[PDB]
Amino acid sequence: MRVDELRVDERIKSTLKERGIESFYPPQAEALKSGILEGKNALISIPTASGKTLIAEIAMVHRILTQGGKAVYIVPLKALAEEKFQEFQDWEKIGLRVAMATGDYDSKDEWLGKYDIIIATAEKFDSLLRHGSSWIKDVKILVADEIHLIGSRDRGATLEVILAHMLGKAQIIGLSATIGNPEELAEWLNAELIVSDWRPVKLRRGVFYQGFVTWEDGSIDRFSSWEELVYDAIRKKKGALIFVNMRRKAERVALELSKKVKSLLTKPEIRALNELADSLEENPTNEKLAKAIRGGVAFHHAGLGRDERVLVEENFRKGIIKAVVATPTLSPAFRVIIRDIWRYSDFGMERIPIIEVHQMLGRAGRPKYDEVGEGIIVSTSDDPREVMNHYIFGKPEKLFSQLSNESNLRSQVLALIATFGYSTVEEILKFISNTFYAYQRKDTYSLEEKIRNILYFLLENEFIEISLEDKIRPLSLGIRTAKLYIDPYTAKMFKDKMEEVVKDPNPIGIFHLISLTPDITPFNYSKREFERLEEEYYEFKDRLYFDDPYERKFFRAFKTALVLLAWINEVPEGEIVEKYSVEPGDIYRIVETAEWLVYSLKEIAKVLGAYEIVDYLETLRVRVKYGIREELIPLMQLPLVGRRRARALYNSGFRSIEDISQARPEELLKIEVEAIFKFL
Ligand SMILES: Nc1ncnc2c1ncn2[C@@H]1O[C@H](COP(=O)(O)OP(=O)(O)O)[C@@H](O)[C@H]1O
């Protein structure tokens, strides 16, 4: 279909044409003629290579221009909201304001009312719905990207919940990978179903087994080693993406490949890569990343800060970095190699889900540069036919509502009571009746039981109250916990230990307490280091708020408190990565969450009259945020600074914002500006 053949405002067609887009893919055409332009809901299951977002953008912009109102675009992760935020920019060229909201849970962000397209994660949007933001009533369409993740245990319940509140109140468009139960999901959504595997660039999938690649079509090709697939890609002027199941694994493989890929690079490429590696922030994890980039290959996993991941992401696009070895969580190229089909799980090593293996292979074949994309699954100790039959011809897993997730369900039952007006068991059960859990007609009895037991726990801890008529009402602790977005249990742990906190409020005691609640995943420790951890604990137990571990979460929480303490004590990131065996990306993630939990602890204190420690906690909140000593807090409002600069400034001079408001710029570059002078 032709962009002009579409029945939508010229302002959409203009934007498209400017994007290079002149014609719609067959799948896109089907979706655009299904009824979405006329407000109907839809579930779009087609290859990512086939422009799923584009269809959502067109449906969103058409909804807005033709009838006003707002459009919500739910993204799976914070970082994916920034990618969607950029590609949505050119919509401001026709007057549409685009906002990005992904955190700061305890606010209603009424300031979002002046926007047309709001990008958010499901949790952020779930919290906004709890605060009752006035503009929410203006959302006429909501797009759920990666809607299949609704079947993911971790956070699939949150996505299901917002989709349950919004259904029948707004147009809903879901974007998902191929799944086992398309019709089921579509029906629950009362949506038009668009299922297709049409792609712009032919994809050939195979299995590499002992020197040979066997393609689904039947042919067999010789390759001395799987890594040869990479070197072959590179010699034909293309690139490769390699997937492994463990960080250190990605790091090892990346370096190994770079050892042979380097000899495959032109002189210019070598320079850029070298300039690229020299331009990386010092620390152990970047050291490795540097060494392999100089060789033309890169690794990528959550262990790297977001800054480094982006650097890899773009330079791979720019064709400078020839290959990228990446782990699944937070990851187009001629060849996509899936090096591992087995992954270490909390359930014990298991095979990567079919659904995920298809998404990985789907990234093979850049629409312009290639006449075909190749997806290769490497089996080391696995029957080649079984791998082929399971991953290339096996129906993808069907999605299962992950609503029963006890942590999400206790936080959600409370949200209904304290922020949505549910005052009866039967009312709560009515909300559940509208979820995908209910539509799948899954375990009904066991869910009720889990809900009554939850109500009890909530009743026993004073978040809510119940009467002899069985009427439920929220108490301040209830309401306050629901608006802070914390797990009722972390509020319960905050409430139980509050007396201990006020008796002796200290970083170690605090950092350890929050690192032990359900809203934070504590750093891991090895058999080796559990040595010191043991001694230090018994050495500091006085400052903690707990009697005696006797247990694994405990010391993981304690290890985390030591990292956090080093963080606020301005210890070099490098020194922390070393002296604690932790990678930068984990530090930030943990710092980010810590700031949020210390804030929530302060707020809970406010609700329990414990106001004397509120200042202390507020102070600690900022220190955790920027990882800085108390006397560096004023200087943090500046454009940029971070613990590094801020310290250099305070010591080598300045201490206030007025102090920088009157320093010879000559005296700043003398150690540290453009942004700063720009800020003033
Ligand atoms: N009809 C089309 N014509 C040309 N390129 C397209 C078309 N649809 C998608 N694309 C390409 O696919 C890229 C992928 O993003 P997008 O289209 O939003 O799909 P997805 O949500 O699967 O990433 C776009 O930036 C563009 O390069």
* CATH classification at residue 138: 3.40.50.300
- Indicate whether 455 and 525 sit together in one domain: yes
3-class DSSP string for 641-668: CHHHHHHHHHHCCCCCHHHHCCCCHHHC
Angle in degrees, 0-180, between the axes of helices 227-235 and 247-261, rounded to the nearest 10 = 50
- Indicate whether 387 and 365 sit together in one domain: yes
- Indicate whether 414 and 561 sit together in one domain: yes
User: Are 462 and 477 in contact, with CB atoms under 8 Å apart?
Assistant: yes
What is the sign, positive or negative, of the torsion defined by CA atoms of 505, 511, 516, 520? positive
| Among 145, 155, 200, CA closest to 175 | 145
Instruction: Look at residues 364, 393, 422 and tell me which one is the last residue of a structural domain.
Output: 393
Question: What's the 339 CA to ligand 1 centre distance in angstroms?
Answer: 27
- Indicate whether 423 and 528 sit together in one domain: yes
- Indicate whether 465 and 323 sit together in one domain: no
- Indicate whether 194 and 205 sit together in one domain: no
Question: What's the 360 CA to ligand 1 centre distance in angstroms?
Answer: 17
- What distance in Å separates the CA atoms of residue 422 and residue 644, rounded to the nearest whole number? 49
Exp. method: X-ray
Q: Looking at residue 333, what DSSP letter applies? A: B
Beta strands in 126-232 (DSSP E): 139-145, 171-176, 192-195, 203-208, 212-215, 220-222
- Indicate whether 440 and 388 sit together in one domain: no
| Among 237, 208, 238, CA closest to 220 | 208
User: Are 290 and 304 in contact, with CB atoms under 8 Å apart?
Assistant: no
User: Are 247 and 340 in contact, with CB atoms under 8 Å apart?
Assistant: no
Question: How many C-beta atoms surround the C-beta of residue 258 within 10 A?
Answer: 24
- Using the structure block, give the residue that is written with the tokens 């026709």: 94
User: Are 248 and 524 in contact, with CB atoms under 8 Å apart?
Assistant: no
Side chain identity at residue 626, one-letter code: Y
| Among 29, 38, 30, 80, CA closest to 59 | 38
List the CATH number of the domain containing 483.
Answer: 1.10.3380.30
Cα 125 to Cα 81, 165, 239, 508: the distances in Å are: 13, 11, 38, 33
Residues in the chain: 680
Q: Is 46 annotated as belonging to a binding site?
A: yes
Instruction: Look at residues 629, 648, 663 and tell me which one is the last residue of a structural domain.
Output: 629
What proportions of the chain, in percent to the nearest 5, are helix, strand and coil? Answer: 55, 15, 35
425 in ligand 1 pocket by Cβ < 6 Å?
no
24 in ligand 1 pocket by Cβ < 6 Å?
yes
Instruction: Look at residues 150, 178, 200 and tell me which one is the last residue of a structural domain.
Output: 200
User: Are 341 and 351 in contact, with CB atoms under 8 Å apart?
Assistant: yes
C-alpha angle 86-100-477 in degrees, rounded to nearest 5: 160
Closest residue CA from atom 19 of ligand 1: 51
Question: What's the 140 CA to ligand 1 centre distance in angstroms?
Answer: 24
User: Are 475 and 462 in contact, with CB atoms under 8 Å apart?
Assistant: yes
Q: Select from 45, 54, 87 the residue to mutate for testing ligand 1; criterion: most ligand atoms less than 8 Å from CB.
A: 54
Residue 1 belongs to a domain: no
Beta strands in 340-486 (DSSP E): 342-343, 350-351, 373-378, 464-466, 472-474
Q: Are strands 220-222 and 212-215 parallel, antiparallel or unpaired?
A: antiparallel
Burial of 358 (0-12, 13-18, 19+ CB in 10 A): buried
Residue 3 belongs to a domain: no
Q: Is 329 annotated as belonging to a binding site?
A: no
- What distance in Å separates the CA atoms of residue 491 and residue 463, rounded to the nearest whole number? 9
Largest CA distance in the chain: 81
Which helix (H) or strand (E) element contains residue 120? strand 117-121
- Using the structure block, give the residue that is written with the tokens 């906690």: 617
Residue 652 belongs to a domain: yes
Residue 400 belongs to a domain: no
Resolution in A: 2.4
DSSP helix/strand/coil, 407: helix
Domain that holds residue 550: 405-629
Q: Which positions ≥6 away from 640 have C-beta within 8 Å?
A: 675, 676
DSSP 511-529: HHHHTTSTT--PPP--TTT
Q: Is 50 annotated as belonging to a binding site?
A: yes
Q: Is 117 annotated as belonging to a binding site?
A: no
User: Are 194 and 365 in contact, with CB atoms under 8 Å apart?
Assistant: no
Residue 233 belongs to a domain: yes
Q: Which positions ≥6 away from 348 have C-beta within 8 Å?
A: none
List the CATH number of the domain containing 649.
Answer: 1.10.150.20
Dihedral over alpha carbons 239, 242, 247, 253 (to 10 degrees): -80
User: Are 341 and 350 in contact, with CB atoms under 8 Å apart?
Assistant: no
Question: How many C-beta atoms surround the C-beta of residue 70 within 10 A?
Answer: 23
- Indicate whether 93 and 219 sit together in one domain: no
Question: What's the 608 CA to ligand 1 centre distance in angstroms?
Answer: 52
- What distance in Å separates the CA atoms of residue 222 and residue 209, rounded to the nearest whole number? 10
- Indicate whether 249 and 211 sit together in one domain: yes
Q: Which positions ≥6 away from 418 have C-beta within 8 Å?
A: 463, 464, 474, 478, 479, 481, 482, 483
The pair of three-digit structure tokens given for residue 288, joined into one six-digit string: 């490795």
Q: How many CA atoms lie within 13 A of 576 on its CB side?
A: 25
Closest residue CA from atom 18 of ligand 1: 53
- Indicate whether 438 and 374 sit together in one domain: no
Side chain identity at residue 90, one-letter code: D
- Indicate whether 433 and 541 sit together in one domain: yes
The pair of three-digit structure tokens given for residue 352, joined into one six-digit string: 């990567």
554 in ligand 1 pocket by Cβ < 6 Å?
no
Residue 42 belongs to a domain: yes
Q: Are strands 472-474 and 323-326 parallel, antiparallel or unpaired?
A: unpaired
Question: What's the 298 CA to ligand 1 centre distance in angstroms?
Answer: 25
User: Are 334 and 239 in contact, with CB atoms under 8 Å apart?
Assistant: yes
DSSP helix/strand/coil, 337: strand
| Among 378, 314, 370, 360, CA closest to 48 | 360
54 in ligand 1 pocket by Cβ < 6 Å?
yes
Q: Which positions ≥6 away from 448 have C-beta within 8 Å?
A: 429
User: Are 337 and 240 in contact, with CB atoms under 8 Å apart?
Assistant: yes
Dihedral over alpha carbons 347, 349, 350, 355 (to 10 degrees): 90
Cα 297 to Cα 377, 550, 678: the distances in Å are: 20, 47, 38
Which helix (H) or strand (E) element contains residue 416? helix 406-420
Closest residue CA from atom 5 of ligand 1: 21
Q: Is 404 annotated as belonging to a binding site?
A: no
52 in ligand 1 pocket by Cβ < 6 Å?
yes
- Indicate whether 387 and 269 sit together in one domain: yes
Domain count, the chain: 4
Q: Looking at residue 2, what DSSP letter applies? A: B
51 in ligand 1 pocket by Cβ < 6 Å?
yes
| Among 220, 93, 75, CA closest to 158 | 75
Residue 41 belongs to a domain: yes
Which helix (H) or strand (E) element contains residue 496? helix 488-503
Residue 399 belongs to a domain: no
